Structure formats: C-alpha cells, structure tokens
Amino acid sequence: NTKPNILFILCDDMGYGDLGCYGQPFIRTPHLDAMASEGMRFTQAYAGSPVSAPSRASFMTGQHTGHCEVRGNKEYWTNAPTVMYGNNKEYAVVGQHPYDPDHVILPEIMKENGYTTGMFGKWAGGYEGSCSTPDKRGIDEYFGYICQFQAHLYYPNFLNRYSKALGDTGVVRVIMDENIKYPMYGADYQKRPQYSADMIHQKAMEWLDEQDGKQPFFGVLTYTLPHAELVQPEDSILNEYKEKFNPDKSYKGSEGSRYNAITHVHAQFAGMITRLDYYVGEVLKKLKEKGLDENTLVIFSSDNGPHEEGGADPTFFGRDGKLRGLKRQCYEGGIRIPFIARWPGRVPAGTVNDHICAFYDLMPTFCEIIGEKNYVKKYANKDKEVDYFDGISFAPTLLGKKKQKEHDFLYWEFNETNQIGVRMGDWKMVVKKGIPFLYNLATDIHEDNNVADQHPEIVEKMKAVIFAQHTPNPHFSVTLPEK
C-alpha cells in the first residue's frame, strides 16, 4: 500500500463475452487472459450506463444515472463553427455535456491525496472550453480525444493534449500533420498514416516511463478500441484474422457517423480487440520493468456492452454468450462488462468474484484503497441541497477479505431506448417506455421470460427503488412507471 499506484484501463464498447477469459471463442486475448490468471475476474460487475458518456460520468462522479449530471450522449459540436485542416472541414469546438463543476470527480480526490494523474484516450466529460475539461478537473497529463464523435475516426485531423510537463495553459489541439493531407472519408482515407490508438498508447507509455517509486500515480487509460470505426493498421494482427475468418462481411460506410467503409469486418473487430490486448501486455510489462508491479493495482474494464456499429457483428462474436442485448439496452448485455483486477500479493490470484457492483462504486473503492477515510464528509459540496454519492466500496472483496457490504439495488436509466434497469439480487427489472418487465437472473440469465405478472410485490418493491433513486434532469428524460 503506502499509497499504491492505480491504473484503470477502461476500453470502449467491449461486451462481457468479447474476451477469451469470459468465453470468447474467436479472438485471442492472451495478455488479459494471463492478467485474469494472476488476478480476480468479476462476473457481476456493471457499467454506469449502457452508453459511453454517462457510464464514464458514473465512474468519475461516484453517482448512478438517477442522480448524475450526465445520463446520455449530448453533443455540443453540432452548430460549432468550421476550421479547415488542409481541404478537410472540421468542428472548431468538439465534445459532450460537461460534468457538474460543483461535484467532485475521482482524479480530484487522487490529486488531494498527493497523486500525479494521467489520462490517455477519450475524455467525453465536457467540450473544449467548458467547465469540465481534464486540465480543470484534476488531470496533470492528458492526451487523446476530448470528443466521443471525433473518436469515430482512428485517423483523425487532430488529437487533444493538456500536459503540465509541456506548460500547456489548457487543452490544445495537436494536428495530425500527415492525416490532414487526405480526406476524412472514401478510397483515400486509408492513406492517412497517423493511427490514434497507437499514438495514444505511445503517449500513455511515455507518461508511465516518467513514473518512479516516489510519487504515487493514478492513470486512466480510456483507449477507444474496439469502438467503431472498424479501421486500423493493415498489419500482422489484422492479417492473422483475415486468414482465419472466411468468408467475412463488409461495411458500406456512414460519412455522417465518421465510420469509414471497410472490408473483412470480423477480421477488423477481432484485430481491434487483439491489438488492445497487446497494449495491455505492454502496460503490464512496463510496470515489471520499472519495479512497480507489487505497488500497482491494474483494473481492465469496458464502459458498456457490445456494439453493432461500423460493421461490428455481435451476433457472430456472441455465439457462445449468455447475456441478452447490446449497448443502449438495460438488458444484462448492455450493462454487464468485463472487469479484471490484478495487484500481485494483494488481490488473490486466479479468482472469480461474483460481488454485484457498478462503476459508481469505484470512487469509494479507490478512496478505501488509498486510506482516504470519510470521503463523503470531505468531498461533498455543502452549498448543494443534496450532493449524491451512490457507491459502496468493494475494496474488501477485491483484497479477498471481510466486511464486504452489499447493495440493496443497482440502478440505471437511459433516454435513447427510454429504459430503467434495477437489479436486486437474483431479480432484474427492465422498464421499457414506462412498462416494467421482470426477470430472474438465476433461472433466466438471458432475460427471455418476463415474469412481472407472477411477482406483483417484487415489481412494486423495485418500482419503489426507481421512485426513490430517480431525480429530474432537464437534459436527459426517461418515462417512469405508473405509481
């Protein structure tokens, strides 16, 4: 301990069944499988939300989406002025709805505990010049995509940086000086040579290189893989899967979505996950090389369930999977995610953990690990009517030990599919357009058999949770069930 280092590798749109160690049959994930072998594989860990921005917001704020300022994907670039990068028209302001500036986020707690903070990849927590950019919210070294929409292109016009070390005064843009010579869409797009996932990992690894045993570090590696578009370097990883998958399918492109057309989509998606796995192997190798392995907790997870964008084929990859649904659904497949922890000599090796937990638990979990006691009394905003903190530390079960507290419920709400999810032990409610559906995850893991009619008292108990946990948010609307 003595303030352990923490790396949180949070990937983008990877399903529960997309890793080898969670049963994926078609994709090699040797480094994450070995991480699991040496660590703890969580079987009932959940995203903050079935989509990116609120799931990441839940992790950052320690709040469920009945309370969180961010409960959906909200764009601030739609009406932004245009800037030219070569012949390419680009938005002059990018990004999503900002985190509440009056509610603490995890990096700020780590800064108050004497940590240095890094974040490499997707921010998705406020647009350029907003009150919630990484510079303003406790990140010392940031490199990647401020904007989730920008992140659709793996060969973008620019990336974003805030580097204390370089004396940046705020977030800046780093132009991809080779990429902007070519179009953003069509036959010449793949002439772009500056691949963001490699560049962002290289910046993360340069940052990890600078760390030593002295000052504790907190790194958030929000790598965009395997989020669409399904375009990557045409290298030995991709070619392995072009050889393996036969026949394969293709994707015609969506210029409006910034998803380029591509061929061999099974090979592209498998390649993206094996590429990400190789990045994780490089992180773990670096910690060992620097003598930091025994004092660093590494967690790998995904922000939400599997996707069907840019040529992704979750039906194909889901052949052996147990959970129903995709990204944007409050069915188990939208919200239950891979979650692997490794901390040699602290987290018991080769374990499975069934503890029911969600991303809003990470804030109290980390606070417990770093010895930050009574974090709510310390960080709660006294100027608010009420400052919500929804998490329960799972530091005890992570460290194999006693006094592990249990949630009465987990809670999700999501505007685009108009859904509310509640999990109370074996019981799972999905509200769809205000109508409750009820499933037993012990007898019906795939949520095939709506049994609301057989359990009216359970339906009322779980609706009571919704009525108690949902507070109004003027930006993100869901239909509550009838009272």
Ligand X SMILES: CC(=O)N[C@@H]1[C@@H](O)[C@H](O[C@@H]2O[C@H](CO)[C@H](O)[C@H](O)[C@H]2O)[C@@H](CO)O[C@H]1O
- Residue 315 backbone phi and psi in degrees, to 5: -60, -45
Contact between 22 and 323 under an 8 Å Cβ cutoff? The reply is no
Residues 6+ apart with CB under 8 A from 242: 248, 264, 267
Min separation Cβ 147 and Ca ion, Å: 14
Min separation Cβ 309 and ligand X, Å: 5
Binding partner of residue 419 among ligand X, Ca ion, none, CB cut-off 5 to 8 Å per kind: none
Binding partner of residue 256 among ligand X, Ca ion, none, CB cut-off 5 to 8 Å per kind: ligand X
Task: Note the helical H segments in 250-361.
Answer: 265-289, 314-317, 332-335
In the block, tokens 């959906």 appear at 72
In angstroms, the CA 282 to CA 300 distance is 13
Min separation Cβ 148 and ligand X, Å: 4
Q: Is there binding between residue 304 and Ca ion (CB under 5 A)?
A: yes
Q: Is there binding between residue 123 and ligand X (CB under 6 A)?
A: no
For residue 240, what are its two tokens? 């392995």
* 304 is annotated as contributing to ligand binding: yes
How many of the chain's residues bind ligand X (CB under 6 A)? Answer: 9
Q: Is there binding between residue 73 and ligand X (CB under 6 A)?
A: yes
Write the DSSP symbol of residue 481: P
* 102 is annotated as contributing to ligand binding: no
In angstroms, the CA 284 to CA 337 distance is 21
Q: Which of residues 232-261 bind ligand X (CB under 6 A)?
A: 256-257
Q: Which is nearer to ligand X, 78 or 246 (CB)?
A: 78
Min separation Cβ 65 and Ca ion, Å: 14
Strands (E), 15-169: 40-42, 45-46, 82-85, 88-91, 116-121, 141-144, 158-163
**Candidates 9-17, 30-38, 347-355, 434-442 — which segment interacts with Ca ion by CB under 5 A?**
9-17
* 383 is annotated as contributing to ligand binding: no
Q: How many helices (H) and strands (E) does the chain have?
A: 12, 20
Q: Is there binding between residue 313 and ligand X (CB under 6 A)?
A: no
At CA 305, angle to CA 74 and CA 90, rounded to 5? 35
Binding partner of residue 303 among Ca ion, ligand X, none, CB cut-off 5 to 8 Å per kind: Ca ion
Binding partner of residue 148 among ligand X, Ca ion, none, CB cut-off 5 to 8 Å per kind: ligand X
In angstroms, the CA 204 to CA 206 distance is 6
Min separation Cβ 75 and ligand X, Å: 5
Contact between 439 and 424 under an 8 Å Cβ cutoff? The reply is no
Min separation Cβ 268 and ligand X, Å: 16
Binding mask 131-170 for ligand X (x = CB under 6 A): -----------------xx---------------------
- The residues that touch ligand X, with contacts defined as CB under 6 A, are 52, 73, 75, 96, 148-149, 256-257, 309
